[PDB]
């Protein structure tokens, strides 16, 4: 069967379609008009975008398809290196890090991070408790402060102290600026790109300089903490028997911050947006938080008892998965969906927001925010809900992100009533991840002691 394809621009094929502020949202609108699969060509490049559960279930077959590094993540690799996210599955350091790091990211390993997550969540609550009557909350901005600080604390026992400042830590500043440059190179040898190829190097330096010092500092001290750095400095891969070397440990810490901060911040921001736009759902979630969070400080077990809050987060991830696409390649020649022959090496993109709007899986009301869709998670078919990727290349931080977001949203709902005082119109800014730009609320304290 012949594959649909969106509009072309002569010798540029489809490439100008992504020369836009909102490429994923453009790709979603194309999927709306062309259907479950469409070909996307560029000068010397071909990929196929998948939007249906019927095809994505095959793409998630790890015997047939492996993770591909997209063009963007090849540029990210210039400072993320061969950390988990930007390494190929067949690279020795991927499987080593995967085996060493998976125990540090278990649902059960969250018990050790809980106290430091509470540390940063308390700072967030206290900041909002301390706002004056006339004042409002910049939601993604504060969620990003929380998630970056939480990864820094739980990751390598480092305090970015984001709630003490307006201009971020020089590391954070230079990371985002480096991520920006990596993104900008998507639409670009020529000597006009000489200053862009000089500033990139400076941002890589500050990130490398500080994390390497931290690792050197910890090796010299020999101190043992509850962070991922300790586990990485003492872990051994059961298969090779080898530990990670210091350079790869550096890339892993850079990777935790790239991979975790924007997605989790976006999730919290989208979750609060849907709550203020659905007051009946907010009330049901607030009643749960009040019922369950009976102590001044949330316990690890209390966070696990926040069932509805977790459903709220999963429904937010259904509508706006904050890492909205992943890339695959065919391991061998194969036929997709019984009608699309693929050659070894052919690339696929999974368009996750469109998968999550497949009316054959979720029903006709896919645009509605309904947390009750997740009452029984086992009813959802295989590969129908994939906000954390697929298989052995799935998000290693899934339990970390969901524990942090359930804790923080639980505390938010316990301690404040929220007002959508501007009747905010959703505006989704796209970097490599999604976030509701300009989202803003008020929050009136329920005056509950906190500690
Ligand atoms: C709501 C929050 C998050 C979302 C939606 C998310 C999404 C994803 C997705 C879709 C992938 C697969 C990417 C691909 O196939 O190319 C991935 C991979 C990854 N994520 Fe997350 N992520 C989140 C939070 C986090 C956090 C908190 C961490 C903490 C370090 C993290 C670390 C990673 C790593 C290391 C990988 C690569 C894993 C591997 O291939 O071995 N993520 N993430």
UniProtKB/Swiss-Prot annotation:
Coiled-coil residues: none
Protein residues bound to heme: 395
Effect the entry attributes to changing residue 259 to M: No effective fatty acid oxidation. No effect on electron transport from NADPH to FMN. Slightly lower high-spin conversion with arachidonate, palmitoleate, palmitate, myristate and laurate/dodecanoate
Annotated positions binding (9Z)-hexadecenoate: 49
Subcellular location: Cytoplasm
Region (Cytochrome P450): 1-451
Effect of residue 80 to F: 800-fold binding affinity for laurate as substrate. High coupling of NADPH consumption to laurate formation. Very much more effective in indole hydroxylation. Favors omega-2 hydroxylation
Biotechnology: This protein is a target of protein engineering. Its selectivity-directing and activity-enhancing mutations have been extensively studied and the designed mutations allow this enzyme to act on non-native substrates and/or in order to enhance production of synthetically desirable end-products.
Outcome, altering residue 259 to H/K: No significant stimulation of NADPH oxidation induced by addition of fatty acids and no hydroxylated products, but cytochrome c reductase activity levels are identical to wild-type enzyme. More negative reduction potential with dithionite
Effect seen on changing residue 84 to E: Ineffective covalent modification of the heme macrocycle. Extensive formation of Fe(II)CO complex in the substrate-free form
Site (Important for catalytic activity): 263
Record annotation: effect of changing residue 72 to G: Higher activity in the hydroxylation of highly branched fatty acids
Effect noted on mutating residue 263 to A: Contrary to wild-type, significant decrease in the formation of the high-spin complex via substrate binding, and decreased substrate-induced reduction potential shift with saturating concentrations of arachidonate
Induction of expression: By pentobarbital. Expression is negatively regulated by repressor bm3R1 at the transcriptional level.
Summary of the function given for this chain in its UniProt record: Functions as a fatty acid monooxygenase. Catalyzes hydroxylation of fatty acids at omega-1, omega-2 and omega-3 positions. Shows activity toward medium and long-chain fatty acids, with optimum chain lengths of 12, 14 and 16 carbons (lauric, myristic, and palmitic acids). Able to metabolize some of these primary metabolites to secondary and tertiary products. Marginal activity towards short chain lengths of 8-10 carbons. Hydroxylates highly branched fatty acids, which play an essential role in membrane fluidity regulation.
Family of this protein: In the N-terminal section; belongs to the cytochrome P450 family.
Protein name (database record): Bifunctional cytochrome P450/NADPH--P450 reductase
Gene (UniProt): cyp102A1
